Amino acid sequence: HPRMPKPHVFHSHQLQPPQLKVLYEKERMWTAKKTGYVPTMDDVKAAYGDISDEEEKKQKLELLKLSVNNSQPLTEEEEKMKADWESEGFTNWNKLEFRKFITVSGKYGRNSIQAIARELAPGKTLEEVRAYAKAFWSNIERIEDYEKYLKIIENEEEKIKRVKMQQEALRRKLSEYKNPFFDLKLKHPPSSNNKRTYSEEEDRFILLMLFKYGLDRDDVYELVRDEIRDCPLFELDFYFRSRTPVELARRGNTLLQCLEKEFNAGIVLDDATKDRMKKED
Amino acid sequence: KPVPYAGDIIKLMAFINKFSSFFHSDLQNLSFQDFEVGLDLYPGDPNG
Amino acid sequence: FDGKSAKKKGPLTTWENLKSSSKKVFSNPLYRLRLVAREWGYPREWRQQLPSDQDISKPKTALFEQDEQTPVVDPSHPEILTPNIYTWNANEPLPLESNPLYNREMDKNGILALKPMDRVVLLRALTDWCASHSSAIHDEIYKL
Amino acid sequence: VPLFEGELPDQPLANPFSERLYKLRLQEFFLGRVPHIGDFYMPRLHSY
Numbered sequence: 001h002p003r004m005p006k007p008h009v010f011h012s013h014q015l016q017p018p019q020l021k022v023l024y025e026k027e028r029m030w031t032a033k034k035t036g037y038v039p040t041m042d043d044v045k046a047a048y049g050d051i052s053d054e055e056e057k058k059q060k061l062e063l064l065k066l067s068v069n070n071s072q073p074l075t076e077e078e079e080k081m082k083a084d085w086e087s088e089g090f091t092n093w094n095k096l097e098f099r100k101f102i103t104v105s106g107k108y109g110r111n112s113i114q115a116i117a118r119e120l121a122p123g124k125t126l127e128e129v130r131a132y133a134k135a136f137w138s139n140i141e142r143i144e145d146y147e148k149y150l151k152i153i154e155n156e157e158e159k160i161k162r163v164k165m166q167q168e169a170l171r172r173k174l175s176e177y178k179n180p181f182f183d184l185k186l187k188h189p190p191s192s193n194n195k196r197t198y199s200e201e202e203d204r205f206i207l208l209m210l211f212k213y214g215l216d217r218d219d220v221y222e223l224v225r226d227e228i229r230d231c232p233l234f235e236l237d238f239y240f241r242s243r244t245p246v247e248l249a250r251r252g253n254t255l256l257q258c259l260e261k262e263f264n265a266g267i268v269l270d271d272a273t274k275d276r277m278k279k280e281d
Numbered sequence: 282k283p284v285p286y287a288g289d290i291i292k293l294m295a296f297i298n299k300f301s302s303f304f305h306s307d308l309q310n311l312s313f314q315d316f317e318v319g320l321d322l323y324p325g326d327p328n329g
Numbered sequence: 330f331d332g333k334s335a336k337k338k339g340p341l342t343t344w345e346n347l348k349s350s351s352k353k354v355f356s357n358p359l360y361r362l363r364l365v366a367r368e369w370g371y372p373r374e375w376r377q378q379l380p381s382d383q384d385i386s387k388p389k390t391a392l393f394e395q396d397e398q399t400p401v402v403d404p405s406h407p408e409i410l411t412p413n414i415y416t417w418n419a420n421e422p423l424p425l426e427s428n429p430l431y432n433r434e435m436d437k438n439g440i441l442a443l444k445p446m447d448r449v450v451l452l453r454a455l456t457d458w459c460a461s462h463s464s465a466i467h468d469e470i471y472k473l
Numbered sequence: 474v475p476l477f478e479g480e481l482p483d484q485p486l487a488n489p490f491s492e493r494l495y496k497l498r499l500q501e502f503f504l505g506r507v508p509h510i511g512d513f514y515m516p517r518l519h520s521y
Binding site for chain 3: 108109110111112113114115130131133134137157160161164212213218219222223225226229230238239241242244274
């Protein structure tokens with residue numbers, strides 16, 4: 001008796017139009033008439049709209065006499081135009097392929113085509129990804145939970161960018177002072193809330209050493225420990241040793257933040273502006 | 282005399298000093314010479 | 330048994346402890362150490378120093394970025410978070426046979442199985458990771 | 474010494490080897506700093 005006026009699966013959407021779901025309901029639509037499936041408060045559930053109401057006698061009967069007396073009993077146009085509507089989508093990128101695609105894209109940046117693709121190759125070929133990513137932004141509106149799916153993209157890149165102008169920020173200073181190991185100043189943010197154990201010039205070395213590597217955001221904290229393991233002047237401290245690169249992050253990030261807060265009026269000075277072709281700036 | 286290996290010994294010894302409670306009394310009176318002879322090191326060489 | 334153990338009081342090692350009948354007391358600690366050493370870091374003289382004067386820590390090993398992603402299919406964000414990435418030039422330790430740590434004698438022979446300078450190196454190293462990991466003393470110092 | 478209570482808790486001329494604050498950071502086999510030359514080191518033993 002009851003058919004499924006919940007048409008073919010769309011939660012695992014492949015970037016497909018909704019008239020396709022209309023034509024999938026059209027498959028229901030003949031099946032309702034051909035096999036005698038009457039729309040009912042069970043069947044009429046997308047258009048349910050009847051909570052102890054008398055919409056049951058009319059809204060259900062609307063779908064009833066529409067379905068049984070279907071004046072579109074899979075008219076030959078329905079098969080064709082549904083096929084194009086499902087053709088215009090991206091069948092491969094189911095929620096498995098979807099979620100990895102969008103997550104890995106958010107990771108390396110909204111634009112890391114090859115980078116995410118070198119992982120996404122099992123997902124599909126690169127140009128499909130290029131095509132799929134292209135229509136992804138254009139049809140993110142065609143994506144359920146898409147805003148949060150975009151939040152996990154754009155917010156993800158921000159911390160990555162956060163180091164990028166910190167890369168930039170430390171570029172400034174190590175290029176800025178002349179003998180920073182004897183000239184540097186960070187008394188703008190002296191300290192937030194700290195037992196201020198590492199004195200400055202110690203830290204000047206490390207930041208000199210950290211940035212002579214630069215803001216690699218990969219392994220520097222591991223590396224400078226090795227230098228602290230090996231620095232003839234700095235082997236002499238023992239506190240520098242019982243601090244593993246794990247803790248060295250705590251200090252190192254802090255001072256990253258310290259120069260950050262010192263240069264918070266100076267990092268963004270060369271951080272967040274990009275121009276385009278057709279507007280004088 | 283060039284002694285490429287001394288300050289290493291120095292850290293050895295100072296560490297040991299700060300950690301007396303951790304270390305044997307026989308360790309507590311150790312000297313530079315102890316390590317020289319025991320470890321078979323001779324000064325003079327810039328190369329070790 | 331960190332710091333406080335069954336034998337809590339006193340230095341952890343005694344004359345009888347070395348003169349004990351185990352005859353290879355160095356074995357298991359040496360095993361433990363060669364386990365933790367590869368990731369605990371090495372001194373330069375026990376690093377497999379670069380023959381290649383191109384994988385300096387400062388540059389990287391090899392060009393993992395085959396090409397920069399200039400033709401963004403998303404022109405709305407011309408910014409790229411994958412400009413040019415590489416393979417990583419971390420310093421390496423020696424081969425294990427080239428690692429004097431992997432000389433069996435110390436199990437029975439003890440520290441006197443090496444070149445002297447290498448012995449010095451290993452002692453400095455043992456101090457290094459003891460200060461970094463001997464969690465009893467490691468907390469004690471920071472307390473103090 | 475008992476005079477220096479409201480003043481500094483330790484003398485400008487006091488015993489360094491009684492401080493748990495100036496304990497870790499202290500180097501002791503230092504024996505002298507000399508301009509344009511450097512420093513003079515005297516490893517003698519434990520003192521703690």
